[PDB]
């Protein structure tokens, strides 16, 4: 049934690191051949690709590093892929999914294996384990994962109810060594919850997947890509502002890099991560130096940064974008800003990927500054090259601003400030805001980390071995914020909250002309308005809206995990623990936004809810509406009846 | 009599920057003639040596920048001060600072007679008006003297009450332009109390004064230059905790400076003062590019710096200094500490000047990263030239951080750490510490800005024109703490607080071991304890010893300005309103050190009170005596009796 294929689901993600001991996956896995039968999937070329790729010693075998920022990598993990979103009934892609297991590369399983299970019409609803417990080595420092084995050592026979069931409490980047003061922001940008994020947003819109074919195209993906990439750095920025940091440094290609990173994590091979050093020098010869390279495009790391970046800046002050066919294609279309969003992606869908490429894949090649592979299997990946990992490292940051700088100069360039009658919504006015104080404290996280140490083949079966981590999430009280609207008729409307900073990390005032950038979706809902005085209720544990429409979550959630809050999956979702950022015991002094609209529906594709069904989105305003563009008066934005400017302080206790 | 001594005294003082128009100043001066007479000065070299630099072309002249550091501005001012410190009598004295005033350079002229004045036996009494407002030009940015200028040529006549006392409202450095973040100190930087301070101690301590000539080798001198630079360092870093900033930054001769100086003031002549931008190469050829020199010593300031560098880390690992003699000088000695300070000060004290020479002032012309003067008489010298806004550069804490270190390294390598019996008072005992809510505000201070016009001969005699400036300034309310002493018979203790950083910037315990040289005195007096149970109560507004041991100040304030909270100028004077740091609304944490020890009398020379009658201290234990020297054990600091730590929120309020 629904919930055996579950639980099947999920017992495919024990101890990846290790063949699959139950009988069942070994029966199944030793006497399948998908190349055998060759007919039970959908198409014949995808069936034929991965087994050229299998056969013919061009295939990762276990035990190897993966990267989904190689080429080869990314190729051998699209065709698996294909080879399990194509099978034509479920059973056939869970003996594929067994088979998988039990012979390929256990990172190119596990990621061919949830794009699919996010993608397939089947399997669209499924609950998957959390990715910090599946794969622990993305997650910890390699001091958690060695006191792990060091209990799984111990633990035989003797001294019972002792190495067992023991909680190991993790701390982060910063405890032991002096990293560099950017990793103080440990706590969250190394959150098991926000990297989760991270990783399941790239999960359900894979930088190579085609919108075309996988239906993606159909949730646009351009202003998707713009938004949560400006939503991640916005919070990020509320996070800075809260610890007393500034905006995020701006770096040239031709300076040396300023800041360096220091991982504590380790591959499960025992190879330790790639560090960064500070003021690194990103020029082919210095981060080349001393290398054998010869026939690796990545060692130009550099050269292709540089032709991207020149070719995006040409795209978006011309407007004008360049095909295969040579033509000139408008960019000032009303999906102007997808197109934009593609081009820069390097997905599919970009306008001509031989011309503008896949500018993130190099950056992030150049910014983790490791060796180059001296082979395809042998590859030695920083944490910028994995998705689990990205936001790990402050590049990142500092990188996706130097591409949303891009989009910025788009829309200034290109669009026209908004006016009073474009957001106006006559008949309405937002009276006042009242939010209950607004109180953030650190609280112990307890996750199953058992996954990281080699069972044997009974306790496999048993799992008798139990070995938690223990660490300090950060959390808020829950509380209730009061919309108060005066209507003129019985009205269907958006409301629109944001949150963002008020005063910098020097005490100034932040004019909106300034600060439109950094205001962060708080809640997204619509509510049916009634003549006269309105009052809105929402509760902290039902905003499912944060930096992201989602609303066809929860009832995935009353499906799945609803058979509380547990580690969802479903869409992206942000920690309901980190939505609020971090404060001060005086109180950092943010700002909310509260807007309110008549509806425009989406051009949903498809009722039922699904990754390219169109059913994600609340409205049709454009992502991010009054602040998706820059602001030419400030005081504009105050007048607005339908607009309210809200005050809040963020204490901080602990 | 006394007080019309101090009228006059004051008179002197009014409108350096024009010739005095009382009639009394006039005829003076130009019936005055000190070497006419030539015989009322008790010694005739130093009127001989003013006059040959008076007539034969080799004087400051009326109107031009005058800089302590410079060579010849520097012998000027000596044989000025010379020449005004041997009057036989104090009218003599006084007809001479009258010609003065009329004649010799306003900056050269005001440093010799205030050197004079608090030196001179006669007048070591007298106050002083406060120098932020004789020549304001040096306390406040252009833009206060330009607007000040504007009142000035409004007002004439037309529009009474009206552009006359006016109150200018000054904002910090960073109000206007986006300076380097480490001005963004500038409330206390260039705070008006903080540089009185800097030039109230240099004029009381000179740099180039003799202790064996002026009596100042009986303060030691030595010992008051490390622990008031010391101190300085330590309240710095303690308003860098309060604001989120770190230890002061380490900088290397050889790597470009990486931190910029814009000021903001400007001459009285016009010229702006000079400007170092960031990341500022410090190399002969870079700070001399495109410039004349060919004899300016200071133009090679860079390899004296090095050289006195090389020669004081060598005298300090010796252990053993070099002296004309060219024989071996014992620095282990009991005042091994004051020699070390006079060797780095370079003072005629040092052991050798020609050898270790002026380090502070070479490192100065440096950092000050100015135009090396084309002439003598044409010089362009920056805030670090000046003792009245040193303190206004970040490069003068990190200058003389580099200084501090030397000291640290010969005490780490010569002197052993306390034990229990060295700290312990047997029969003392620290039972608990009471300090009541430290509250920190700001509110605007008022001073007499009318220096910086330039007025009528009508307006001068009658001061007609008033034009004040308010500055929001660092207050606390006012507390009172109490110390409880169980003791066990009638002894007689000094008792020593200190005051100190808990948590660094980052929230991480600072051990005493890394902490000891980051204890502000806060205050150091002298109870007489009974046997049994003893309370002592102690005011904010009783406090003279902060940073600094001032026994015999406030008879001084009873008898001058005694005829509240005025600007002292008596011995060295911190502002009563920054005794204590700046807080935070929820509430910066330090912690306060309460020590107790017997009496042990300083070696006075004299009962009189005077600079370098040693009347000065409190007791006869090294400055800063518990931490004087690296602790090797904080378990022993905490287990001492005769000792207490006691923490302490300071909370800043608006």
């Known amino acids: 049934n629904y919930s055996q294929q579950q639980r099947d689901v999920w017992r495919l993600f024990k101890y990846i690191n290790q063949p699959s001991y139950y009988k069942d996956h070994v029966e199944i896995a030793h006497s399948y051949y998908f190349y055998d039968h060759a007919s039970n999937y959908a198409k014949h070329e995808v069936v034929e690709e991965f087994y050229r790729y299998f056969k013919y010693d061009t295939f990762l075998q276990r035990g190897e590093i993966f990267s989904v920022f190689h080429g080869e990598h990314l190729k051998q993990a699209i065709a698996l892929f294909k080879l399990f979103y194509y099978a034509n009934d479920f059973d056939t892609f869970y003996k594929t999914a067994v088979w998988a297991r039990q012979h390929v590369n256990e990172g190119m399983f596990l990621y061919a294996f949830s794009v699919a299970l996010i993608h397939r019409p089947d399997t669209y609803y499924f609950s998957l384990p959390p990715i910090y417990e599946?794969?622990?080595?993305?997650?910890?420092?390699?001091?958690?994962?060695?006191?792990?084995?060091?209990?799984?050592?111990?633990?035989?026979?003797?001294?019972?109810?002792?190495?067992?069931?023991?909680?190991?409490?993790?701390?982060?980047?910063?405890?032991?060594?002096?990293?560099?003061?950017?990793?103080?922001?440990?706590?969250?940008?190394?959150?098991?919850?926000?990297?989760?994020?991270?990783?399941?947003?790239?999960?359900?819109?894979?930088?190579?997947?085609?919108?075309?074919?996988?239906?993606?195209?159909?949730?646009?993906?351009?202003?998707?890509?713009?938004?949560?990439?400006?939503?991640?750095?916005?919070?990020?920025?509320?996070?800075?502002?809260?610890?007393?940091?500034?905006?995020?440094?701006?770096?040239?290609?031709?300076?040396?890099?300023?800041?360096?990173?220091?991982?504590?994590?380790?591959?499960?091979?025992?190879?330790?991560?790639?560090?960064?050093?500070?003021?690194?020098?990103?020029?082919?010869?210095?981060?080349?130096?001393?290398?054998?390279?010869?026939?690796?495009?990545?060692?130009?790391?550099?050269?292709?940064?540089?032709?991207?970046?020149?070719?995006?800046?040409?795209?978006?002050?011309?407007?004008?974008?360049?095909?295969?066919?040579?033509?000139?294609?408008?960019?000032?279309?009303?999906?102007?800003?997808?197109?934009?969003?593609?081009?820069?992606?390097?997905?599919?869908?970009?306008?001509?990927?031989?011309?503008?490429?896949?500018?993130?894949?190099?950056?992030?090649?150049?910014?983790?500054?490791?060796?180059?592979?001296?082979?395809?299997?042998?590859?030695?990946?920083?944490?910028?090259?994995?998705?689990?990992?990205?936001m790990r490292d402050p590049a990142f940051y500092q990188l996706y601003k130097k591409l949303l700088g891009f989009f910025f100069r788009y829309k200034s360039q290109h669009y026209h400030y908004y006016d009073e009658h474009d957001l106006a919504y006559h008949g309405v006015h937002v009276k006042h805001v009242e939010v209950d104080p607004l109180v953030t404290y650190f609280d112990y996280f307890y996750a199953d980390l058992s996954n990281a140490v080699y069972v044997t083949p009974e306790e496999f079966v048993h799992d008798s071995f139990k070995v938690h981590v223990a660490q300090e999430r950060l959390n808020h009280k829950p509380f209730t914020y009061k919309i108060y609207i005066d209507s003129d008729k019985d009205t269907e409307a958006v409301v629109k909250v944001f949150l963002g900073p008020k005063y910098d990390e020097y005490g100034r005032y932040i004019n909106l002309t300034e600060n439109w950038m950094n205001f962060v979706q708080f809640d997204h809902f619509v509510y049916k308005l009634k003549s006269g005085e309105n009052v809105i209720s929402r509760n902290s544990h039902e905003i499912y809206n944060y930096i992201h429409d989602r609303t066809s979550y929860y009832e995935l959630y009353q499906k799945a995990f609803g058979v509380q809050f547990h580690d969802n999956q479903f869409f992206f979702g942000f920690p309901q623990r980190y939505m609020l950022p971090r404060g001060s015991p005086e109180g950092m002094t943010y700002q909310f936004y509260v807007f309110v609209t008549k509806y425009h529906p989406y051009k949903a594709h498809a009722s039922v809810p699904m990754v390219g069904s169109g059913m994600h989105y609340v409205d049709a305003y454009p992502m991010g509406y009054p602040f998706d563009r820059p602001v030419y008066y400030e005081e504009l934005f105050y007048a607005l009846p339908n607009s309210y400017f809200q005050d809040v302080r963020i204490y901080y206790q602990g």
Chains 1, 2 share one sequence.
């Open 134 to 390: 599946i794969y622990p080595h993305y997650f910890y420092n390699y001091e958690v994962i060695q006191k792990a084995q060091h209990y799984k050592q111990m633990y035989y026979g003797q001294d019972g109810a002792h190495y067992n069931d023991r909680t190991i409490y993790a701390n982060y980047s910063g405890y032991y060594v002096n990293v560099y003061p950017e990793q103080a922001l440990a706590y969250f940008t190394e959150d098991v919850g926000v990297n989760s994020f991270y990783y399941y947003y790239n999960l359900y819109y894979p930088y190579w997947m085609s919108g075309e074919e996988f239906n993606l195209k159909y949730d646009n993906r351009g202003e998707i890509f713009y938004y949560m990439y400006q939503q991640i750095l916005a919070r990020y920025y509320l996070e800075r502002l809260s610890h007393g940091f500034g905006e995020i440094d701006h770096f040239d290609w031709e300076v040396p890099f300023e800041s360096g990173y220091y991982p504590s994590m380790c591959y499960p091979n025992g190879l330790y991560f790639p560090t960064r050093h500070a003021y690194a020098h990103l020029y082919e010869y210095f981060y080349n130096y001393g290398q054998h390279y010869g026939f690796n495009k990545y060692a130009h790391s550099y050269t292709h940064i540089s032709d991207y970046e020149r070719r995006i800046h040409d795209v978006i002050d011309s407007g004008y974008v360049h095909t295969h066919s040579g033509q000139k294609v408008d960019l000032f279309s009303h999906e102007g800003l997808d197109i934009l969003g593609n081009l820069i992606e390097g997905n599919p869908e970009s306008p001509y990927y031989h011309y503008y490429g896949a500018y993130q894949v190099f950056a992030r090649h150049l910014l983790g500054y490791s060796h180059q592979p001296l082979t395809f299997h042998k590859l030695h990946p920083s944490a910028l090259e994995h998705f689990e990992t990205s």
